[PDB]
Every structure is written in C-alpha cells, then in structure tokens.
Amino acid sequence: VSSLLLQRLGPSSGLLVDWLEMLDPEVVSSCPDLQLRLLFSRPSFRPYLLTLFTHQSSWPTLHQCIRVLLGKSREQRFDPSASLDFLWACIHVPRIWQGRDQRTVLRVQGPELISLVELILAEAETRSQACSLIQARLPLLLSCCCGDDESVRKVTEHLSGCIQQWGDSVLGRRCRDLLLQLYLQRPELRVPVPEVLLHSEGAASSSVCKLDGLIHRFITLLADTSDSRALENRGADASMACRKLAVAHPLLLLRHLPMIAALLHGRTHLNFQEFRQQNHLSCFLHVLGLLELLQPHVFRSEHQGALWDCLLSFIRLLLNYRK
Amino acid sequence: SGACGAFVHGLEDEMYEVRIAAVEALCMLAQSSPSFAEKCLDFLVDMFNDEIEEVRLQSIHTMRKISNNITLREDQLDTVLAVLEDSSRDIREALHELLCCTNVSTKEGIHLALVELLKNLTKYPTDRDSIWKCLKFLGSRHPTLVLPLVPELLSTHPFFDTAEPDMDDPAYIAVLVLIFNAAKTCPTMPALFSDHTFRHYAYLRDSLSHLVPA
Amino acid sequence: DNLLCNLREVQCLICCLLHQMYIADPNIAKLVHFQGYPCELLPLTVAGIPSMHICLDFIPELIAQPELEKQIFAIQLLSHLCIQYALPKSLSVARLAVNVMGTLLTVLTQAKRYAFFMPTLPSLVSFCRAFPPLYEDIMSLLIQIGQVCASDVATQTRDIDPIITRLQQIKEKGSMDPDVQLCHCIERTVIEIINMSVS
Amino acid sequence: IFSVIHSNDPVARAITLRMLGSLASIIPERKNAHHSIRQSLDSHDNVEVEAAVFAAANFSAQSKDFAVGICNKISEMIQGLATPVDLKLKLIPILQHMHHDAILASS
C-alpha cells in the first residue's frame, strides 16, 4: 500500500489511505523509511496521514520521529513545513494539556536545536520565493530552548556564523531577522551587538520585545519629577540606570524614542519660574545625556523622525526662554 | 483704520443671524488662511456658551473645520470639554465630532479628555457609540501620547494579577477602544498589556470590528 | 522529557479528576493538604488543578499546626501558590509565612533548624519572584538565618569550614555535616534570589 | 446563565455552552456569547470543545454574523494539525449552516 501511494492516483487514493490506516495503526510502525518519506519529503493526503501520526502513535514513536527530523545532518530531505507543523502539533497535543486553565517546554540538545533553526531557515527560504512565517515559527524555537541561557547563546553564535558564512544572501538576511527577533525576545544574553545587526533595518518595524514594558515604565517613572527629595533621588537612579541601559543595550531604547519625544512635548510650554520650582529642566538634562549616549545608533530613519520631533520640542523650549 | 475689532462686534451682536453669519465668515476666512486660525480659537471657545443653540452648533462646526491643522492648549481644551455636560445631545455629538479632529498638546490633556468622556458616558449612556468613535479617532491620531498613560488606564499592577475587568462594560470598552487604536501605530504598546486584555481585544475585534483595528 | 510522556498524560487525567473532587467538596482538598503529600508533586498539583487557590484560605491554619512537617508543607505549598496566584491575600499569607519562619528560627533547636530550613529555604526564591515588596523582609530573614548558622558552624570543628570560604565565587548548579549544608543552602537561595532579580 | 462560563470547571463550561446553544433561537447576535463559543472552540478539555461545537452549530443556524465569523475559524481548525480526526469529523458539518449568503456559501 505504501509503495502504491508513494508513486496520478486520483480517485483510489482514498481507498489506499483507508487501508494503511486500517492495517498500520501507529502509521510509521512498519518499514519506517517508507512512511518517513511519505509524511515528510519534497502530496494530497499528507495532512490526513500527519494528523493520524500526531494523534495515533506512541510517545516513543514520536520521540524517534523528532530525533530523526532533527538528527539529519546532511539531508534537507524532509519538508520544512510538514516537519515544523508536526513539531508544533506534538508540543500542543491536547492530551498533554488537558485540564490546564490556559491563563498565564521541550528539552532538546545542541545539535538538534541547530538542525531546528536550519529547518526554520529552510522554511523561510521556501516561503520568500516575509517575516511573518519566520516570526510564526519563533515560539517553537523558544519552546525548545526553554529559556536556557546556554541554548540561547549557542543559537546566537551559530547564527553569527551563518551570517558570516552566507555573506549577504537572502538566507543570511533571514538569519539576521530571526537573530534580531531572538535578541528582542531574550535580551538577557548580554552579548555586545555586532555591526551587522546595527545595519539591519527590520528592528524598528512591527515586532515584539520582552523588556519594552520595563523601559517604558522607567521613562514614565523618571518623568514624574515631583517635589519629594526621596523621589528626586529615585529619579536620579532612574536617569543613570537608563544611561547604563542605553550604553549596554541601545536598540531596545531606540524603539522608545517617540516615547521621549512625547514626554518632552508635554512640559515645553510651561513658564520659566514654574520650570525651575517643579524641577523639570533636570529631566531635559537627563534625556539629553541619554541621547548623547545613544549615538550613533540613534541615527536611522525612524530614529531620525523621533529625533526631528524631539529637536522641534527642544528648539521650542529654547525660543520659549529667549528672555 | 476703521477695520479694528469688527469680528468681535459681529460676535457680540444681538441678532443671532448676525452671529451665525459672522462665525461662518470666520470659518471660511480661517480655512483660506491657516495662520489666521490661531487667533480665533479662543473667541470660538466662548461661543460654546452662547444663548442660541444654533449659534453654539455652528461654532462647534467651525471649530471642527479649522482646528484640523492646529493645536489646543490646556485651558482651551478643558473649557471645550466642560460643555459636554450640556443636555442638548445634538451639540454633544457635534462636540464629539470636534474631538475626533482636535489635537492635544500633553498627555494630561488626553487624561482629562477621556475622564470627561467617561463622565459623559455615566451621564448620557445612549451616546456611547459616538463616544467610542471619538476615542477611536483620539487614539488613532495621538498614539505616541496615549502610550505612557496605558498602565494607568488598564490599572495594571507591577506584580499582582488584576481581576479581569468586566467585558461589555461601556466605560471599559471605551478605554480599550482608545488603547487599541493608539496601538495601531505603536508596536511597543501591546507588550504592555495583560492576557485578558488580549482576550478582550479579540472580543472587541469581532463585535466592534468597525471601531477597533488589527 | 516530562512533557511528552505517558506519565504526563496520566498526570493530566488525575489532575482533572482531583479538580472535580475538590470542586465537589473543598473539605477534601483541605484534608489532603493537611495530611500533605510529597513536595515533588506540588508544581504539578498547583499548575494542573485550578481549584487550588482555595488553599490560600487555609494556609494560615496549616501554618499554625504544631507538626514541623505540616509547617514545611504549608511554606512550600504557599510558595507554589504565590508563584501561581499573585493576589493581595496571597501576599498577606506570604508575609505571614515569612514572619512565622523568622519566628521559629529562634524557637527551633539545632537539628530542628536544619530540618525546617532545608526544604523551606527554596520557597524564598518563589516568594521573591511573586512579591518584590518582600525583599527587605526576605533578605533580613536570610541574613538572620545565615548569621545563626555561621555561629553554629563556628561552635564545632568542621570538615569544610564555610567561614574561611567567605570569598568564594558562584557555584552554579555529599556527606557533609548539617550546619555546613544549611550554610550552603542559605548561600544557594541567595544566589537564586539575586539571579532571579537580575533576570 | 452566562456567568458560569467563567468557572474554571470545564464541565460547567460545557453545560453553559450547550445552554447557549439551546438559547440560540431567542438570543442570537449576543456577541459575548459568540466570543465564548469562539474561545471555547480551541480549548483543551474535550467536553468543552464538543459543547462549543454544538453551540457553534446552533448559532451558525441562527446568526449570519456568527456564521461568517466562524467559517474562517473552522477552516483553520480543520487545516490545523493539532485537531484530531474525530474532532475534525464533528467540526465539518457546522458548514451546512453557511446558507445565509452567496459568497459565504461559495467560500
């Protein structure tokens, strides 16, 4: 039956599919290579057989299958799409998550994870002939890393090597894309930023970050420069902490440039005497120091627009105190 | 020479027909000359306390037409908002239409704005669709000024997990409409949400598709 | 790999059944937790059973029990619940747990101090994860236990002598005497707390 | 009736979804109910998913808006791979209630 199906076969394919569902319950139990090239290769009834294999086979069977999918160090034989969908389905079998409330984690070694990111790159290359698919497969990578710092660092250095080896290929550009997305999702890795990422343009478009809420909290917190001297020293800690974060991790701040623009738009018009008694000029000094640190990564297109708005606010303040 | 303070005489006349004609002349003159529009804003603000409701409605229409390209300051903004308590629902929706086109200086202005809007919700609940339109445009046009208010708006806590705010509550839907609309062009905003805000986002997506964007 | 195993499916089935039982009669949930069960099951039974937030309504009663093992289980169960449900009442019971753990630090003898603080010290990183406002109390308690255990170490000759290891580095990750073990446990939870706060 | 859809007990949610399915005739176009059907569709408990399917059948028979909203979810649910074969089988005949519109029927 498997040989007949692998060979076109219009009407009778359903009959044969029913047959090997009947006599091959665990699907890939008998003659595994035939079924492996059936389910994952370069067909029509493939999704049905994939569903059967996902929801019908023993756990050792699926473990061996994922070890096969991630242990092929020469092939590029299995389809990236089918393999990745299968992995996602296996993670999210309902039987594993039955009973969870669903209101607010797979272990894989080094080389398997490298094969996984290579398969994601294969997916990206097949689709490009968008960043949507590469972002879509990203939570699978994070569900396999499980937040392990060693795995994140290994993927990072493998991607650096892939960027360097591939030069500026399309796949190299996609390597940079998922590398910047990984840096966004896990900035705990304190690796200094290579210039290849600084030349990357896609960071300032639509994206998702893990620390943006915190730095947003930082800048709104520092902005409330009320009269309490304990709060004033707290604001000083906030300003220098943002200074250190700017020098250490600049790009996350660079997605918070319209933030500072809006923060400074508010207080520009108020008069000089109230300017000094409510202590807002210190906030201007702090953000000036920030931006002085943030160069020269503060000088790309969206950064240029936010800087233009901030400088309009600055010169408005300057003209506001010409006397 | 003899052309000093003519428009103020027209607006301080007793015939409401003269005042309507004068304020329409102000609308057309400000439309032709954008730089002129700054000087007539305060005079138009006083006309929102006029005696004849047609004069007030016409002043609101003029303001909506001419405040398109210019900015309000705080006192002018709150005086604009304070008339929302008026009983005439027609001038209320007209004022809402103004607020769709107004421009705010500072985030405290937006905070005062939607505080007044939800107070209006408590007062005149039947207008809630119009106020949601107002907030739709308010968020859609000041996205960068709405974002530093978001954690205050959602009452989010630094470490506690909050009670899921009651969905299909008109004030809360209004707040979400404002926040999601500002998030249409502010990619850093969604990570500041909570999980039930994503759930409520899906709910407002399907039920209020015309209001809330992707 | 835990997640993908027949053990995990069985755990989910048992969790669904226990959820039904606890909804039907919450007194059963209270009785089971007063008896206690292996602490290894606590992440499983706290994650998989949505009706365990009722445990927060009798953690104070479970803490008050004279048995040391009931107290230890109460601390561990509370730590897992706090990491799950970060509520104001959850913090109130966490404050009570830190207070009771700092209180009986001066009530227990040498052996009982070791027995109580080896399982309940990994609960402090969970409290600190859930509740940043506990940092002052947690580290004051931790420095108190550390000073007590260092004093106890100095009393007798030891094979390791952690005092002269005052300037050793991180030990990121077994026949030693209990006092040195408890000293190392205090250090270990301190690095876990600091790692958590910086990550 | 709707308040018990927030209960963490999946059997209570299942009975609630079936209740809303029984009440689809008198209160269609109740959008929070639609949202409950949609969220409960991709749940993990099997009884909750079946109750959501039954309620979806009833509401698709009643509401045109619900039918057009749910046809895409059903398509991505069948084409989804984590959905087992029997659930797919129960999920297909929701589509017999897409007779409200010409483009709906064509899709």
Binding site: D101, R103 | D161, T162, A163, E164, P165, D166, M167, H196 | Y22, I23, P26, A29, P50, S51, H53, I54, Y85, L87 | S3, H6, S7, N8, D9, A12
Partner: peptide
C-alpha cells in the same frame, strides 16, 4: 469558591 479563578470577572447580582 473553588469553581472560579480569583481573577475571574466577578458576578454582580
């Protein structure tokens, strides 16, 4: 109550 999460939307009679 054991049947409702603490963060669930409260029911107001």
């Amino acid at each position: 109550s054991p049947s409702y999460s603490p963060t669930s939307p409260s029911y107001s009679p």
